[PDB]
Design a protein around this ligand. Structure first.
Ligand code: CA
Length: 368
């Protein structure tokens, strides 16, 4: 297998989803900070280049009608990554793509919170992508965690799936966002929520012909600033373990994360149009939208009748190892520190990545 960049349109064949329907009958959401004007141009570039049918989009101002929904330039890169990866992974079509735009003028974390809130209150997107986060402890300190979890709980109860990136700072989320801190480990919010699916990151290897070859932990070491780039993983210091997680024995009574993982290494990352320019981008910010696109196909396959799938993932995969690619090699730390991947569920990658056709069949026979 080879480490290389990938067009989003290749993820269905890498993760075994070509024989499933596209997401044409499922509506998908994406949370952003600020506007997406350039993003929408970039998205036009993407569908046209790949010869795809255009995507029906909507943009929503989730807060004050006088708030700041101007484009954030660095932001467009994320929303680019998110939207192109979702649509590629979905097999090239979604019913509609909604951009839930957070007000940039709002106080504290209130803009983001209202954006989560509008997606939930409208209840039209079945799956919503969240490619962002920060130190859960900071979120806890100022009341943001409590506020946002109420909203995710409502989502789960109404059958909506929020997908959240686990982080890109490995075990060192709360140390200046990724600076090595020896044996001191932390995690990112909102991934640590039990009411969302947390998606970690892999190093993705492919055959010459482009088939799946294997996956190791995402960990590309330190940048020139001294910051670690690797998959977020561990357990929450605040959130209690949901009981479906009890099948992972020998772990504390806390929410363990991530749940599942997909491609995240920049070296094996996605090729994305940004301000008209193709760039090779990675992170758990990529793995999450790959899951969202794949999961949107299974909804389309099941008349969008699949509720919040955490409990089901844990029971099905623990009893059916063929449903996933089990990551077994690497760590999400530095200098000897960090968690190591291993047989079955582990802290850097969770259950690993999903084999979609096999999951599809399982659901055929057993429901989800
Ligand atoms: Ca494993």
């Amino acid at each position: 297998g080879t480490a290389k960049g990938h067009n989003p349109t290749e993820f269905p064949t890498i993760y075994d989803a070509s024989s499933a329907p596209t997401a044409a009958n499922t509506t998908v959401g994406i949370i952003t900070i600020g506007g997406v004007s350039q993003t929408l141009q970039d998205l036009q570039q993407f569908t046209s280049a790949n010869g795809l049918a255009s995507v029906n989009t909507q943009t929503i101002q989730t807060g004050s009608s006088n708030g700041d929904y101007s484009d954030d330039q660095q932001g467009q890169g994320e929303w680019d990554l998110d939207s192109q990866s979702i649509v590629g992974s979905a097999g090239g079509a979604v019913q509609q793509l909604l951009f839930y735009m957070a007000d940039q003028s709002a106080s504290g974390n209130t803009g983001l919170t209202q954006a989560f809130n509008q997606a939930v209150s409208d209840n039209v997107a079945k799956v919503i992508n969240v490619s962002l986060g920060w130190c859960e402890a900071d979120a806890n300190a100022d009341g943001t965690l409590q506020a946002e979890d109420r909203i995710f709980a409502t989502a789960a109860a109404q059958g909506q799936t929020f997908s959240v990136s686990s982080g890109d700072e490995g075990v060192y989320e709360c140390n200046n966002r990724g600076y090595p801190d020896g044996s001191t480990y932390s995690v990112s919010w909102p991934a640590s929520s039990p009411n969302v699916i947390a998606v970690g990151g892999t190093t993705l290897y492919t055959t010459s012909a482009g088939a799946y070859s294997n996956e190791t932990v995402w960990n590309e070491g330190l940048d020139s600033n001294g910051k670690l780039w690797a998959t977020g993983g561990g357990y929450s210091v605040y959130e209690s373990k949901p009981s479906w997680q009890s099948v992972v024995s020998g772990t504390p009574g806390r929410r363990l994360l991530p749940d599942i993982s997909f491609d995240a290494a920049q070296g094996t990352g996605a090729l994305i149009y940004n301000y008209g320019q193709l760039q090779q981008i990675g992170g758990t910010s990529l793995a999450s939208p790959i899951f969202v696109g794949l999961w949107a196909r299974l909804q389309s396959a099941n008349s969008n009748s699949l509720g919040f799938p955490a409990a089901s993932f844990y029971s099905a995969i623990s009893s059916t190892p063929s449903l996933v690619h089990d990551v077994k090699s690497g760590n999400n730390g530095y200098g000897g520190y960090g968690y190591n991947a291993g047989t079955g569920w582990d802290y850097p990658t969770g259950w690993g990545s999903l084999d979609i056709a096999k999951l599809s069949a399982y659901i055929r026979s057993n429901g989800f």
